[PDB]
């Protein structure tokens, strides 16, 4: 019997995964056993399995974990599976980069599903503020002009009878800090880390990265983000948006499904926000348009005693039918680019816009030491948000924080 470890990807995560593999089980005449790891403990459990040799056949891995676990020497090469699924041209480039440790020419993980983020907006609020959505979400200048108009607007939510916040975004020292910043960094022409001068180094303190960071964080100093937003997580901001408190916020495609679910079943179909829902990609910066991608991949431990059957299950879970099916349950975009043509996506205007957003997808570099980089970036970005909460983020203060971040990161990148 094969054993798979997964994270809570869908509302009934084990059940959905079992329904997903039921045809594979029938064709191979096996049961696949599943264990669900909470996102909190998943990494600890997976590293304990890597060090001990005691674990599942397959594990889910977040895309940013691939480099670290690969570098431990515990993953089976899966170039054969990826060739079977269509090779490099079967994936968005940003997704293909998540199949390996950066600069390896051997794949160790199979793309499973993508998490990308775009802006949701209140179509009624923008109509009432006189804001063209295409031009608000096309450029930085359009975006900040749109928030200005939304702040000035006399519009009130029909249900709350109160104004809407122009923009809600969190400012907590969580991993979401870095992916909410990344499109602004990238659109300015910056990066979190880059190769330069023969080494990997932080680029958080580059003029371009600082430009992007300051543009975004300064919106919360201009009155466009309510103070209360800064200490909420993405779940709480999503609930504020559903409750008619927010004109604009960034998230993945899951909320699209929930706008069709009645409040009696855990959704928000009856709320004004569900009936007046738009999506747009992140605006272009001066140096280009980028959409953050994350999500999850699958990997096979090389200590598995069922590698041949495990490889057949990776091809199954990576392939068209299972990619389309699982997306109905996760609300996430398939990792397999072919699957985006399915009518389940193309006949839903809001999902078609996420697929437009996908063309601009970009991932973090697949470094073995990525988690140490991310922790240091998150902590220092959280200090910049904390200055925002005081109305004291200046460009020089932001630069000094990112200078400290860059020294810490540069030191982390020198050890292995
Ligand atoms: O604040 S830490 O970079 O020393
Ligand atoms: Cl980067």
CSV table of C-alpha atoms and ligand atoms in Angstrom, one decimal:
chain,number,residue,atom,x,y,z
A,1,UNK,CA,0.0,0.0,0.0
A,2,UNK,CA,1.3,3.4,-0.9
A,3,UNK,CA,1.4,6.1,1.8
A,4,UNK,CA,1.1,9.8,0.8
A,5,UNK,CA,1.5,12.8,3.1
A,6,UNK,CA,-0.5,15.9,2.2
A,7,UNK,CA,-1.4,19.3,3.8
A,8,UNK,CA,-4.9,20.6,4.2
A,9,UNK,CA,-5.4,21.6,0.5
A,10,UNK,CA,-9.3,21.5,0.5
A,11,UNK,CA,-12.1,21.5,2.9
A,12,UNK,CA,-12.1,17.7,3.5
A,13,UNK,CA,-8.5,17.1,2.6
A,14,UNK,CA,-8.1,13.3,3.1
A,15,UNK,CA,-11.5,12.6,1.5
A,16,UNK,CA,-10.8,14.8,-1.5
A,17,UNK,CA,-7.5,13.2,-2.0
A,18,UNK,CA,-9.0,9.6,-1.7
A,19,UNK,CA,-11.8,10.5,-4.2
A,20,UNK,CA,-9.0,12.0,-6.5
A,21,UNK,CA,-7.0,8.7,-6.6
A,22,UNK,CA,-10.0,6.3,-6.7
A,23,UNK,CA,-9.5,5.6,-10.4
A,24,UNK,CA,-5.8,5.0,-10.0
A,25,UNK,CA,-6.7,2.6,-7.1
A,26,UNK,CA,-9.1,0.7,-9.3
A,27,UNK,CA,-6.7,0.4,-12.3
A,28,UNK,CA,-3.7,-0.7,-10.1
A,29,UNK,CA,-5.9,-2.8,-7.7
A,30,UNK,CA,-4.5,-1.0,-4.6
A,31,UNK,CA,-5.5,1.4,-1.8
A,32,UNK,CA,-3.5,4.5,-1.4
A,33,UNK,CA,-3.3,5.7,2.3
A,34,UNK,CA,-3.3,9.4,3.1
A,35,UNK,CA,-2.2,11.3,6.1
A,36,UNK,CA,-2.9,15.0,6.4
A,37,UNK,CA,-0.2,17.1,8.1
A,38,UNK,CA,-1.1,20.6,9.4
A,39,UNK,CA,0.9,23.3,7.7
A,40,UNK,CA,2.3,24.2,11.2
A,41,UNK,CA,4.1,20.8,11.7
A,42,UNK,CA,4.4,19.6,8.1
A,43,UNK,CA,7.9,20.8,7.7
A,44,UNK,CA,9.2,19.2,11.0
A,45,UNK,CA,7.5,15.9,10.1
A,46,UNK,CA,9.0,15.9,6.6
A,47,UNK,CA,12.5,16.8,7.8
A,48,UNK,CA,12.3,14.0,10.5
A,49,UNK,CA,11.3,11.5,7.7
A,50,UNK,CA,14.2,12.8,5.5
A,51,UNK,CA,16.8,12.3,8.4
A,52,UNK,CA,15.4,9.0,9.7
A,53,UNK,CA,14.2,7.1,6.6
A,54,UNK,CA,10.9,6.6,8.3
A,55,UNK,CA,8.2,8.2,6.3
A,56,UNK,CA,5.6,8.0,3.4
A,57,UNK,CA,6.3,7.0,-0.2
A,58,UNK,CA,5.2,10.4,-1.5
A,59,UNK,CA,5.0,13.8,0.3
A,60,UNK,CA,3.6,17.1,-0.7
A,61,UNK,CA,6.2,19.9,-0.5
A,62,UNK,CA,5.6,23.6,-0.7
A,63,UNK,CA,7.4,25.0,-3.7
A,64,UNK,CA,9.9,26.9,-1.5
A,65,UNK,CA,10.9,23.6,0.3
A,66,UNK,CA,12.0,21.7,-2.8
A,67,UNK,CA,15.6,23.1,-2.7
A,68,UNK,CA,16.2,22.3,1.0
A,69,UNK,CA,14.8,18.7,0.9
A,70,UNK,CA,16.6,18.0,-2.5
A,71,UNK,CA,19.9,19.1,-1.0
A,72,UNK,CA,19.5,16.4,1.8
A,73,UNK,CA,19.9,13.6,-0.9
A,74,UNK,CA,16.6,11.9,0.1
A,75,UNK,CA,14.5,12.5,-3.1
A,76,UNK,CA,14.1,10.2,-6.0
A,77,UNK,CA,14.8,11.8,-9.4
A,78,UNK,CA,11.6,12.3,-11.4
A,79,UNK,CA,12.9,13.5,-14.8
A,80,UNK,CA,11.1,10.4,-16.2
A,81,UNK,CA,7.7,11.4,-14.8
A,82,UNK,CA,8.0,15.0,-16.0
A,83,UNK,CA,9.0,13.9,-19.5
A,84,UNK,CA,5.9,11.5,-19.5
A,85,UNK,CA,3.8,14.7,-18.6
A,86,UNK,CA,5.3,16.7,-21.5
A,87,UNK,CA,8.6,18.1,-20.2
A,88,UNK,CA,9.5,21.7,-19.7
A,89,UNK,CA,6.9,23.1,-22.2
A,90,UNK,CA,4.1,21.4,-20.2
A,91,UNK,CA,4.6,24.1,-17.4
A,92,UNK,CA,4.8,27.9,-16.9
A,93,UNK,CA,8.5,28.6,-16.6
A,94,UNK,CA,8.1,29.9,-13.0
A,95,UNK,CA,6.5,26.5,-12.2
A,96,UNK,CA,9.2,24.4,-13.9
A,97,UNK,CA,11.8,26.2,-11.8
A,98,UNK,CA,10.1,24.6,-8.7
A,99,UNK,CA,10.9,21.0,-10.0
A,100,UNK,CA,14.5,21.2,-8.8
A,101,UNK,CA,17.2,22.7,-6.7
A,102,UNK,CA,18.3,25.8,-8.4
A,103,UNK,CA,21.0,25.0,-11.1
A,104,UNK,CA,20.4,21.2,-10.8
A,105,UNK,CA,19.7,19.5,-14.1
A,106,UNK,CA,17.7,16.7,-12.3
A,107,UNK,CA,14.1,17.1,-11.2
A,108,UNK,CA,13.2,16.1,-7.7
A,109,UNK,CA,9.6,17.3,-7.5
A,110,UNK,CA,6.5,17.0,-9.7
A,111,UNK,CA,4.3,20.2,-9.9
A,112,UNK,CA,0.9,19.5,-8.2
A,113,UNK,CA,-1.0,22.8,-7.9
A,114,UNK,CA,-0.2,26.6,-8.1
A,115,UNK,CA,-1.2,29.4,-5.7
A,116,UNK,CA,-1.2,32.7,-7.5
A,117,UNK,CA,-2.5,36.0,-6.3
A,118,UNK,CA,-4.5,38.8,-8.0
A,119,UNK,CA,-6.7,41.7,-6.8
A,120,UNK,CA,-10.3,41.2,-6.0
A,121,UNK,CA,-12.4,44.4,-6.2
A,122,UNK,CA,-15.9,45.7,-5.6
A,123,UNK,CA,-17.3,46.5,-9.1
A,124,UNK,CA,-20.0,48.7,-7.5
A,125,UNK,CA,-17.5,50.7,-5.4
A,126,UNK,CA,-15.3,51.4,-8.4
A,127,UNK,CA,-18.3,52.3,-10.5
A,128,UNK,CA,-19.5,54.8,-7.8
A,129,UNK,CA,-15.9,56.3,-7.4
A,130,UNK,CA,-15.7,56.9,-11.1
A,131,UNK,CA,-12.7,54.4,-11.5
A,132,UNK,CA,-12.1,52.4,-14.6
A,133,UNK,CA,-10.9,48.9,-13.3
A,134,UNK,CA,-8.7,48.2,-16.3
A,135,UNK,CA,-6.8,51.4,-15.8
A,136,UNK,CA,-6.7,51.1,-12.0
A,137,UNK,CA,-5.0,47.7,-12.3
A,138,UNK,CA,-2.8,48.4,-15.3
A,139,UNK,CA,0.0,50.5,-13.7
A,140,UNK,CA,1.3,51.9,-10.3
A,141,UNK,CA,0.0,55.4,-11.2
A,142,UNK,CA,-3.5,54.0,-12.1
A,143,UNK,CA,-3.5,51.9,-8.9
A,144,UNK,CA,-2.7,54.8,-6.5
A,145,UNK,CA,-5.0,57.2,-8.4
A,146,UNK,CA,-7.8,54.6,-8.0
A,147,UNK,CA,-7.2,54.3,-4.3
A,148,UNK,CA,-7.3,58.1,-4.0
A,149,UNK,CA,-10.7,58.2,-5.8
A,150,UNK,CA,-12.0,55.3,-3.7
A,151,UNK,CA,-10.9,57.1,-0.4
A,152,UNK,CA,-12.7,60.4,-1.6
A,153,UNK,CA,-15.9,58.4,-2.6
A,154,UNK,CA,-19.2,59.0,-0.8
A,155,UNK,CA,-20.1,55.4,-1.7
A,156,UNK,CA,-21.4,53.3,1.2
A,157,UNK,CA,-21.9,49.5,1.3
A,158,UNK,CA,-25.7,48.9,0.9
A,159,UNK,CA,-25.6,46.4,3.9
A,160,UNK,CA,-23.0,48.1,6.3
A,161,UNK,CA,-24.2,51.7,5.4
A,162,UNK,CA,-20.5,52.6,6.0
A,163,UNK,CA,-17.6,53.6,3.7
A,164,UNK,CA,-15.4,50.9,2.3
A,165,UNK,CA,-11.6,50.9,3.0
A,166,UNK,CA,-9.9,51.5,-0.3
A,167,UNK,CA,-7.3,48.6,0.2
A,168,UNK,CA,-6.9,46.0,2.8
A,169,UNK,CA,-3.5,44.2,3.2
A,170,UNK,CA,-1.9,42.6,6.2
A,171,UNK,CA,1.3,44.0,7.8
A,172,UNK,CA,2.2,41.0,10.1
A,173,UNK,CA,5.6,39.3,10.3
A,174,UNK,CA,4.2,36.2,8.5
A,175,UNK,CA,5.4,34.5,5.2
A,176,UNK,CA,2.5,36.3,3.5
A,177,UNK,CA,4.5,39.5,4.1
A,178,UNK,CA,7.1,38.5,1.6
A,179,UNK,CA,4.7,37.3,-1.1
A,180,UNK,CA,2.5,40.4,-0.8
A,181,UNK,CA,5.6,42.6,-1.3
A,182,UNK,CA,7.2,40.4,-4.1
A,183,UNK,CA,5.2,41.8,-7.1
A,184,UNK,CA,6.0,45.4,-6.1
A,185,UNK,CA,9.7,44.5,-5.7
A,186,UNK,CA,9.7,42.7,-9.0
A,187,UNK,CA,7.6,45.3,-10.9
A,188,UNK,CA,10.1,48.0,-9.9
A,189,UNK,CA,13.0,45.9,-11.4
A,190,UNK,CA,14.2,44.5,-8.0
A,191,UNK,CA,14.5,41.1,-6.4
A,192,UNK,CA,14.7,39.6,-3.0
A,193,UNK,CA,18.0,37.7,-3.9
A,194,UNK,CA,20.0,37.7,-7.0
A,195,UNK,CA,23.3,36.4,-8.4
A,196,UNK,CA,25.9,39.2,-8.6
A,197,UNK,CA,29.6,39.4,-8.2
A,198,UNK,CA,30.0,35.6,-8.2
A,199,UNK,CA,27.6,35.0,-5.3
A,200,UNK,CA,23.9,34.9,-4.2
A,201,UNK,CA,23.2,38.1,-2.4
A,202,UNK,CA,20.2,40.0,-1.0
A,203,UNK,CA,18.8,42.7,-3.3
A,204,UNK,CA,16.2,44.0,-0.8
A,205,UNK,CA,18.4,47.2,-0.3
A,206,UNK,CA,18.7,47.8,-4.2
A,207,UNK,CA,17.3,51.1,-5.3
A,208,UNK,CA,14.7,49.3,-7.4
A,209,UNK,CA,13.6,46.9,-4.6
A,210,UNK,CA,13.3,49.9,-2.2
A,211,UNK,CA,11.2,51.8,-4.9
A,212,UNK,CA,8.7,49.0,-5.0
A,213,UNK,CA,8.6,48.4,-1.3
A,214,UNK,CA,8.2,52.1,-0.5
A,215,UNK,CA,5.4,52.5,-3.2
A,216,UNK,CA,3.4,49.7,-1.6
A,217,UNK,CA,4.0,50.3,2.1
A,218,UNK,CA,3.5,54.1,1.7
A,219,UNK,CA,-0.1,53.4,0.5
A,220,UNK,CA,-0.9,52.5,4.2
A,221,UNK,CA,0.6,55.9,5.3
A,222,UNK,CA,-1.6,57.8,2.7
A,223,UNK,CA,-4.9,56.8,4.4
A,224,UNK,CA,-5.7,54.0,1.7
A,225,UNK,CA,-5.4,51.1,4.3
A,226,UNK,CA,-7.2,51.2,7.6
A,227,UNK,CA,-5.0,50.8,10.7
A,228,UNK,CA,-7.0,47.7,11.7
A,229,UNK,CA,-6.0,45.9,8.5
A,230,UNK,CA,-2.3,45.9,9.4
A,231,UNK,CA,-2.7,43.3,12.2
A,232,UNK,CA,-5.1,40.9,10.4
A,233,UNK,CA,-4.1,37.7,8.5
A,234,UNK,CA,-5.4,36.9,5.0
A,235,UNK,CA,-8.4,34.9,6.4
A,236,UNK,CA,-9.6,37.9,8.4
A,237,UNK,CA,-9.1,40.4,5.5
A,238,UNK,CA,-11.0,37.9,3.3
A,239,UNK,CA,-13.9,37.9,5.9
A,240,UNK,CA,-13.8,41.8,6.0
A,241,UNK,CA,-14.1,41.9,2.2
A,242,UNK,CA,-17.0,39.5,2.2
A,243,UNK,CA,-18.7,41.6,5.0
A,244,UNK,CA,-18.5,44.7,2.7
A,245,UNK,CA,-15.7,46.5,4.5
A,246,UNK,CA,-13.0,46.5,1.7
A,247,UNK,CA,-13.0,47.8,-2.0
A,248,UNK,CA,-9.8,46.0,-3.0
A,249,UNK,CA,-7.7,43.1,-1.6
A,250,UNK,CA,-5.3,40.5,-3.0
A,251,UNK,CA,-5.8,36.8,-2.7
A,252,UNK,CA,-5.9,33.5,-4.7
A,253,UNK,CA,-8.8,32.0,-6.7
A,254,UNK,CA,-10.4,30.1,-3.8
A,255,UNK,CA,-12.8,33.0,-3.0
A,256,UNK,CA,-14.4,32.7,-6.5
A,257,UNK,CA,-16.0,29.4,-5.5
A,258,UNK,CA,-17.1,30.8,-2.1
A,259,UNK,CA,-19.0,33.7,-3.7
A,260,UNK,CA,-21.4,31.1,-5.2
A,261,UNK,CA,-21.9,29.2,-1.8
A,262,UNK,CA,-24.8,30.5,0.3
A,263,UNK,CA,-24.1,31.9,3.9
A,264,UNK,CA,-26.3,28.9,5.1
A,265,UNK,CA,-23.4,26.6,3.8
A,266,UNK,CA,-20.4,28.6,4.9
A,267,UNK,CA,-20.1,31.0,1.8
A,268,UNK,CA,-21.0,34.6,1.1
A,269,UNK,CA,-23.3,34.4,-2.0
A,270,UNK,CA,-26.0,36.8,-0.4
A,271,UNK,CA,-23.5,39.6,0.5
A,272,UNK,CA,-23.3,42.6,-1.8
A,273,UNK,CA,-19.5,41.7,-2.3
A,274,UNK,CA,-20.4,38.4,-4.0
A,275,UNK,CA,-22.8,40.1,-6.5
A,276,UNK,CA,-20.3,42.9,-7.3
A,277,UNK,CA,-17.1,40.9,-7.5
A,278,UNK,CA,-14.2,41.7,-10.0
A,279,UNK,CA,-10.7,40.3,-10.4
A,280,UNK,CA,-7.7,42.0,-12.0
A,281,UNK,CA,-4.0,41.1,-12.1
A,282,UNK,CA,-1.4,43.1,-10.1
A,283,UNK,CA,-0.5,46.3,-11.9
A,284,UNK,CA,2.7,46.7,-14.0
A,285,UNK,CA,5.6,48.5,-12.4
A,286,UNK,CA,8.1,50.7,-14.2
A,287,UNK,CA,10.1,47.5,-15.1
A,288,UNK,CA,7.3,44.9,-15.8
A,289,UNK,CA,4.2,43.0,-14.7
A,290,UNK,CA,4.6,40.1,-12.3
A,291,UNK,CA,2.2,37.7,-10.5
A,292,UNK,CA,3.5,35.8,-7.4
A,293,UNK,CA,3.3,32.0,-7.7
A,294,UNK,CA,3.5,29.5,-4.9
A,295,UNK,CA,1.7,26.2,-4.2
A,296,UNK,CA,2.7,22.6,-3.8
A,297,UNK,CA,4.7,19.9,-5.5
A,298,UNK,CA,4.9,16.1,-4.9
A,299,UNK,CA,8.2,14.3,-4.2
A,300,UNK,CA,9.1,10.6,-3.8
A,301,UNK,CA,11.5,9.6,-0.9
A,302,UNK,CA,14.4,7.5,-2.4
A,303,UNK,CA,14.1,5.2,0.7
A,304,UNK,CA,10.5,4.2,-0.5
A,305,UNK,CA,10.1,0.4,-1.1
A,306,UNK,CA,7.4,1.2,-3.6
A,307,UNK,CA,9.2,3.5,-6.1
A,308,UNK,CA,7.8,2.1,-9.3
A,309,UNK,CA,4.1,2.3,-8.3
A,310,UNK,CA,4.9,5.7,-6.6
A,311,UNK,CA,6.2,7.1,-9.9
A,312,UNK,CA,2.9,5.9,-11.6
A,313,UNK,CA,0.9,7.8,-8.9
A,314,UNK,CA,3.0,10.9,-9.5
A,315,UNK,CA,2.3,10.8,-13.2
A,316,UNK,CA,-1.4,10.3,-12.4
A,317,UNK,CA,-1.6,13.2,-9.9
A,318,UNK,CA,0.5,15.4,-12.4
A,319,UNK,CA,-1.7,14.6,-15.4
A,320,UNK,CA,-4.6,16.3,-17.1
A,321,UNK,CA,-7.6,14.6,-15.6
A,322,UNK,CA,-6.4,14.6,-12.0
A,323,UNK,CA,-5.2,18.3,-12.4
A,324,UNK,CA,-8.7,19.4,-13.6
A,325,UNK,CA,-10.5,17.3,-10.9
A,326,UNK,CA,-8.4,18.5,-7.9
A,327,UNK,CA,-8.8,22.2,-8.8
A,328,UNK,CA,-12.6,21.8,-8.2
A,329,UNK,CA,-11.8,20.8,-4.7
A,330,UNK,CA,-8.8,23.1,-3.8
A,331,UNK,CA,-10.0,26.1,-5.7
A,332,UNK,CA,-6.4,26.5,-6.9
A,333,UNK,CA,-4.9,26.7,-10.4
A,334,UNK,CA,-3.6,23.4,-11.9
A,335,UNK,CA,0.2,23.2,-12.1
A,336,UNK,CA,-0.1,21.5,-15.5
A,337,UNK,CA,-0.5,24.4,-18.0
A,338,UNK,CA,-2.6,22.3,-20.4
A,339,UNK,CA,-5.3,21.9,-17.8
A,340,UNK,CA,-6.1,25.7,-17.8
A,341,UNK,CA,-8.0,25.3,-21.1
A,342,UNK,CA,-10.7,23.2,-19.3
A,343,UNK,CA,-14.2,24.7,-19.5
A,344,UNK,CA,-14.3,24.7,-15.7
A,345,UNK,CA,-11.8,27.6,-16.0
A,346,UNK,CA,-12.4,29.1,-19.4
A,347,UNK,CA,-16.2,29.6,-18.9
A,348,UNK,CA,-15.8,31.4,-15.5
A,349,UNK,CA,-14.8,35.1,-16.3
A,350,UNK,CA,-13.0,35.5,-12.9
A,351,UNK,CA,-11.0,32.3,-13.3
A,352,UNK,CA,-10.1,33.4,-16.9
A,353,UNK,CA,-8.7,36.6,-15.4
A,354,UNK,CA,-6.5,34.5,-12.9
A,355,UNK,CA,-5.2,32.6,-16.0
A,356,UNK,CA,-4.4,36.0,-17.7
A,357,UNK,CA,-2.6,36.8,-14.3
A,358,UNK,CA,-0.8,33.5,-14.6
A,359,UNK,CA,1.0,34.5,-17.8
A,360,UNK,CA,3.1,37.0,-15.6
A,361,UNK,CA,3.9,34.3,-13.0
A,362,UNK,CA,7.2,34.4,-11.0
A,363,UNK,CA,8.6,32.3,-8.1
A,364,UNK,CA,11.3,32.7,-5.6
A,365,UNK,CA,14.7,31.1,-6.6
A,366,UNK,CA,14.8,27.4,-5.6
A,367,UNK,CA,17.7,27.8,-3.2
A,368,UNK,CA,18.6,25.1,-0.6
A,369,UNK,CA,18.8,27.9,2.0
A,370,UNK,CA,15.6,29.7,0.9
A,371,UNK,CA,13.9,29.2,4.3
A,372,UNK,CA,16.7,31.1,6.1
A,373,UNK,CA,16.4,33.9,3.5
A,374,UNK,CA,12.6,34.1,3.8
A,375,UNK,CA,12.7,34.2,7.7
A,376,UNK,CA,15.2,37.1,7.7
A,377,UNK,CA,13.3,39.0,4.9
A,378,UNK,CA,9.9,38.5,6.7
A,379,UNK,CA,11.3,39.7,10.1
A,380,UNK,CA,12.8,42.9,8.5
A,381,UNK,CA,9.7,43.6,6.3
A,382,UNK,CA,7.7,43.2,9.5
A,383,UNK,CA,9.8,46.0,11.1
A,384,UNK,CA,9.1,48.3,8.1
A,385,UNK,CA,5.3,47.6,8.5
A,386,UNK,CA,5.7,48.3,12.2
A,387,UNK,CA,7.0,51.8,11.2
A,388,UNK,CA,4.0,52.2,8.8
A,389,UNK,CA,1.7,51.5,11.9
A,390,UNK,CA,3.3,54.6,13.5
A,391,UNK,CA,3.2,56.7,10.2
A,392,UNK,CA,7.1,56.8,10.5
A,393,UNK,CA,8.2,54.8,7.4
A,394,UNK,CA,10.5,57.1,5.5
A,395,UNK,CA,12.6,56.0,2.5
A,396,UNK,CA,15.8,56.3,4.6
A,397,UNK,CA,14.3,54.2,7.5
A,398,UNK,CA,13.2,51.6,4.9
A,399,UNK,CA,16.8,51.6,3.4
A,400,UNK,CA,18.4,51.2,6.8
A,401,UNK,CA,16.1,48.1,7.6
A,402,UNK,CA,16.8,46.5,4.2
A,403,UNK,CA,20.5,47.2,4.7
A,404,UNK,CA,20.3,45.2,8.0
A,405,UNK,CA,18.2,42.6,6.3
A,406,UNK,CA,20.8,42.3,3.5
A,407,UNK,CA,23.8,41.9,5.8
A,408,UNK,CA,21.9,39.1,7.7
A,409,UNK,CA,20.8,37.4,4.4
A,410,UNK,CA,24.3,37.7,2.9
A,411,UNK,CA,25.8,36.0,6.0
A,412,UNK,CA,23.0,33.2,5.9
A,413,UNK,CA,23.9,32.6,2.1
A,414,UNK,CA,27.7,32.2,3.0
A,415,UNK,CA,26.8,29.1,5.3
A,416,UNK,CA,25.5,25.7,4.1
B,1,LIG,O1,18.1,44.0,13.2
B,1,LIG,S1,19.0,42.9,12.8
B,1,LIG,O2,19.3,43.0,11.4
B,1,LIG,O3,20.3,43.1,13.5
B,2,LIG,CL1,13.4,37.2,-5.9
